[PDB]
């Protein structure tokens, strides 16, 4: 029943007596599979996981500087030098300044000056690599087994599909089992995609774009205190009037990066695993071992009661929840639609094949789904005098 | 002497017997003014100040969000609403999400959802307005009065020029006084310039550019907790799969702003006053009351000694510092250049008019500046047998 209420819902009808049914599962979608003499089954791709990612490279998009220092020399005394020039955490630059008797030099003219400042990253973004073999697709199945909405594993199963194990068989208790032969390697191509993390938000980006980012970077396996390459990308030096030189940081580039990510897929993180809420999986479902659990039940004879008002889903089907006064459960629910209440000739069809009451206890509930004809018809639940009806209009 | 050693040094020679001398003072420049029978005077614009600025407007270039909340409604139950929608610190947006029996709604379909989040500024930039009448130019004067480099107010004066007081007279003790009639209103036009402050750095920017900045802003007179207009400039909402909606902040725009400021003049702050290290002032100097202080001294007769090696400035002049053994001070320094040591015929000229020894104490020092001819010549200091010489080559 898990597709009931999903707007992006597809209905797939297999051939009577057929073995296979092709489906396309997409994040945000849900497929209801029907076939004659089989239980109706809802199937949905709920998660896509990437595991064992490897850190590729980190980029500093916001930096700061401190501990600025200078060395200066008189004209003809050569180039200035600071020992911070031998420290990779520092950025340095040389210029010339006017010197003379008034500031302590025996000769007049241009004296060398060098200025250094310690670079530190405020905020960085990290890129991690993806191996296509490390994908895992999680598929949920939910049988239309007459269970009602909000029941606190026979109607429900979880299946995991991987590149190395593209086939699964989900066992559905009394309903038998369903086979899945999927195509995980087809679809989203992680050949050229890195995983980018910035400020606890995540995207899938193209490698080519990631490798051409004009920002300081440190190596994937550089841990603890980082060593920044291309610090000059965020630091500039200015001089004024042959009197001094200062060092400034270019402001944060976070907005430029966010702008470049407008056309990119978004992702989340599950510990060390990446979780994508986008993508699809093409599967072939084997129906040979799927069975109707309650096809041998007797008819229910006691009185039904609507516990909710029947409700139209976005695709024109109708959901019906009823409470059953009797004790002869398990039993088949008499359920149909009719235009002529005297004939009780069936019109429309049910989506929930073989609606049943399961429990032998009184006042148990069940739910079913119907596909009414266009126009007016009566939903008829139960048999004989105590049957209940609900007049329906479709479109 | 304050121009000695400045690379951007201009020499201005007034007419003999002239009253006026036109000069152009620029930040980073220095003008040496010479005239027959007058002391040589150095004049320099050292600061330009803007006072009484008024805060115009502040822009948020980096924001953050917190206290995110949501309200949701079932289909046919109308639009969602959160009371944070009545709070100006919050940004809000509506969308639709799938609802049905499984998540508590009697009817299936699109239900209204609204999401709000509290906006806060991390970093802002402030623009202040300028009134042209509130400019102040500070001019330093330094007479070539034979004082030496590094002497711990007769040779030095400070003059202040304003739009409302464009004339000044600087008194120079024994040298008389110098008159200045300047053109402060001409020059840098603060008609269309705001003063921008960001991260304790400052620029002069154009009003047109400042008023078109696509960022959230608060009013100049909004104090304490700010009220941000156009918060949407840094906040966006996203939704996914008709299941949810989140709110994200666009990253810092600091780098875009820094990029737009590449072609702008830089400034500093002196308390509440703005200080510019760029610009100029055109002045006319009145020389009628300028006098030579030591024109009546007798000649020095005792022995001079070089205390430093004469040094060539960037413009080819030469500075000479000497110590004087005698006690007959104050007295005139015998000083010249000669190609023929027998003739002692003068060649070249002095920049320091009327070089003198001031003190009557022994072993006092003085400094003078010379303008040698091209080629070889002798710097000759003193008279008779004890005179000292230094052979010079120019170019």
């Amino acid at each position, epitope marked *: 029943i898990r597709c009931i209420g999903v707007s992006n819902r597809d209905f797939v009808e297999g051939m009577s007596g057929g073995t296979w049914v092709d489906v396309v599962l997409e994040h945000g979608g849900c497929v209801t599979v029907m076939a004659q003499d089989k239980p109706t089954v809802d199937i949905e791709l709920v998660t896509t996981t990437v595991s064992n990612m490897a850190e590729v490279r980190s980029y500093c998009y916001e930096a700061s500087i401190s501990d600025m220092a200078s060395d200066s020399r*008189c004209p003809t005394q050569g180039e200035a030098y600071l020992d911070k020039q031998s420290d990779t955490q520092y950025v340095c630059k040389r210029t010339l300044v006017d010197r003379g008797w008034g500031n302590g030099c025996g000769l007049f003219g241009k004296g060398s000056l060098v200025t250094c400042a310690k670079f530190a990253c405020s905020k960085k973004m990290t890129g991690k690599s993806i191996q296509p073999e490390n994908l895992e697709y999680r598929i949920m199945l939910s049988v239309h087994g007459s269970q009602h909405s909000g029941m606190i594993d026979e109607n429900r199963a979880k299946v995991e599909i991987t590149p190395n194990s593209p086939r699964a068989e989900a066992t559905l208790g009394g309903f038998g089992s369903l086979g899945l032969d999927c195509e995980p390697r087809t679809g989203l191509d992680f050949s050229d995609l890195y995983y980018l993390t910035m400020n606890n938000k995540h995207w899938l980006v193209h490698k080519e774009w990631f490798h051409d980012i004009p920002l300081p970077w440190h190596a994937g396996a550089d841990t603890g205190t980082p060593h920044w390459n291309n610090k000059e990308a965020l630091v500039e030096f200015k001089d004024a009037h042959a009197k001094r030189q200062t060092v400034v940081v270019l402001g944060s580039q976070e907005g430029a990066v966010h702008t470049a990510l407008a056309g990119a897929l978004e992702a989340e993180m599950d510990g060390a695993k990446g979780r994508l809420s986008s993508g699809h999986l093409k599967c072939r479902l084997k129906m040979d071992k799927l069975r109707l659990k309650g096809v041998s039940y007797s008819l229910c004879t006691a009185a039904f009661t609507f516990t909710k008002i029947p409700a139209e889903t976005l695709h024109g089907t109708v959901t019906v929840e009823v409470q059953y006064a009797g004790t002869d459960g398990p039993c088949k629910v008499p359920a149909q639609m009719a235009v002529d209440m005297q004939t009780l000739t069936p019109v429309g069809r049910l989506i929930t094949a073989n609606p049943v009451i399961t429990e032998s206890t009184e006042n148990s509930k069940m739910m079913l789904e119907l596909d009414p004809p266009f126009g007016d018809s009566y939903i008829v639940i139960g048999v004989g005098e105590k049957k209940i009806t609900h007049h329906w209009h479709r479109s | 002497i304050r121009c000695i050693g400045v690379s951007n040094r201009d020499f201005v020679e007034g007419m003999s017997g002239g009253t006026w001398v036109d000069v152009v003072l620029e930040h980073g420049g220095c003008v040496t003014v010479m005239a027959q029978d007058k002391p040589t005077v150095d004049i320099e614009l050292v600061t330009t100040t803007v006072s009484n600025m008024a805060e115009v407007r502040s822009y948020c270039y980096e924001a953050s969000i917190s206290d995110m909340a949501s309200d949701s409604r079932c289909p046919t139950q109308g639009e969602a609403y959160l009371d944070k929608q009545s709070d100006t610190q919050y940004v809000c947006k509506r969308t639709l999400v799938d609802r049905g029996w499984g998540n508590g709604c009697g009817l299936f379909g699109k239900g209204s959802l609204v999401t709000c989040a509290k906006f806060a500024c991390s970093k802002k930039m402030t623009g202040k307005s300028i009134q042209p009448e509130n400019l102040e130019y500070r001019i330093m004067l330094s007479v070539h009065g034979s004082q030496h480099s*590094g002497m711990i107010d007769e040779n030095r004066a400070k003059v202040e020029i304003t739009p409302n007081s464009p004339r000044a007279e600087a008194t120079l003790g024994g040298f008389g006084s110098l008159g200045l009639d300047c053109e402060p209103r001409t020059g840098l036009d603060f008609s269309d310039l705001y003063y921008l402050t960001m991260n304790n750095k400052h620029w002069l920017v154009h009003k047109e550019w400042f008023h078109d900045i696509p960022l959230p802003w608060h009013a100049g007179a909004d104090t304490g907790t700010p009220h941000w207009n156009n918060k949407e400039a840094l906040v966006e909402f996203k939704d996914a799969h008709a299941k949810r909606q989140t709110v994200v902040v666009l990253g810092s725009q600091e780098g875009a702003v820094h990029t737009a400021l590449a072609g702008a003049l830089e400034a500093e702050m002196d308390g509440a006053k703005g200080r510019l290290s760029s610009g100029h002032l055109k002045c006319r100097l009145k020389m009628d009351k300028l006098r030579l202080k030591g024109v009546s001294y007798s000649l020095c007769t005792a022995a001079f000694t070089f205390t430093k090696i004469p040094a060539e400035t960037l413009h080819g002049t030469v500075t000479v510092e000497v110590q004087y053994a005698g006690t007959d001070g104050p007295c005139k320094v015998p000083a010249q250049m000669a190609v023929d040591m027998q003739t002692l015929t003068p060649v070249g000229r002095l920049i320091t008019a009327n070089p003198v020894i001031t003190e009557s104490t022994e*072993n006092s020092k003085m400094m003078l500046e010379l303008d040698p001819p091209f080629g070889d010549s002798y710097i000759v200091i003193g008279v008779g047998e004890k005179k000292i010489t230094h052979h010079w080559h120019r170019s």
Partner: antibody, heavy 128, light 109 residues
């Protein structure tokens, strides 16, 4: 009459912090940098750092980079030196000494006649 | 960092010289060389600056010179009142200040 007057002697425990003041009179305070120089008993002078009184900029010796804060109050014409995380080696007489800043308000190169006036010195004894 | 002899002495009336040796980045690099006189219990007093210059009021018996990385303070006509510690100092290429070890001057009685 130029005068620099420093605060009285102090005894402090290792790990604590001292703040010593130097009040300037007879000259315009904002036109000068105030330096701090210390002298352990029987030992040589040791430059610690300076503050530009006109704009608040400072420069510290790398030996004292982390532990020293030099501040100024212009209204009171007073410079302050604070040394934190004291050790036994900090016991010394602390002097202030002036030097003039240039006419653009900057203190890039000192004047030739730096430290022409000194404060009278303040004894600081670090002991537990 | 600057090296000067531990002690220097002379008879009253005679001349003495106190040397102060640094490196190309302080004393041999700039003219920011100064000498200070410190009497016991008092702050240092500037006696010379810019290698050879005297502040107004300092007797001309004090004079200075510099050669390579070595600066020199010469005191002629020694008087008993010249007895003190003397310190050279230099501004450095790094914008710091360094002092010498200090020289005790004794006027032999």
């Amino acid at each position: 009459e130029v005068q620099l007057v420093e605060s009285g002697a102090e005894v402090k425990k290792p790990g604590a912090s001292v703040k010593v003041s130097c009040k300037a009179s007879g000259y315009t305070f904002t036109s000068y940098a105030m330096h701090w120089v210390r002298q352990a008993p029987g030992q040589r002078l040791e430059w610690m750092g300076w503050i530009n009184a006109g704009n608040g900029n400072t420069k510290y010796s790398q030996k004292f980079q982390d532990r020293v804060t030099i501040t100024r109050d212009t209204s009171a014409s007073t410079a302050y030196m604070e040394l934190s995380s004291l050790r036994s080696e900090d016991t010394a007489i602390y002097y202030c000494a002036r030097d003039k800043v240039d006419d653009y308000g900057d203190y890039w190169f000192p004047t030739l006649w730096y430290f022409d006036y000194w404060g009278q010195g303040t004894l600081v004894t670090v002991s537990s | 960092a600057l090296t000067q002899p531990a002690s220097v002495s002379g008879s009253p009336g005679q001349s003495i010289t106190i040397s102060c040796t640094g490196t190309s980045s302080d004393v041999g690099g700039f003219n920011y060389v100064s000498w200070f006189q410190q009497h016991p219990g008092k702050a240092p007093k500037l006696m010379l600056y810019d290698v050879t210059s005297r502040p107004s009021g300092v007797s001309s018996r004090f004079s200075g010179s510099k050669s390579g990385n070595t600066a020199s303070l010469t005191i002629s006509g020694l008087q008993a009142e010249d007895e003190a510690d003397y310190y050279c100092s230099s501004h450095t290429s790094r914008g710091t200040w360094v002092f010498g070890g200090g020289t005790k001057l004794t006027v032999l009685g």
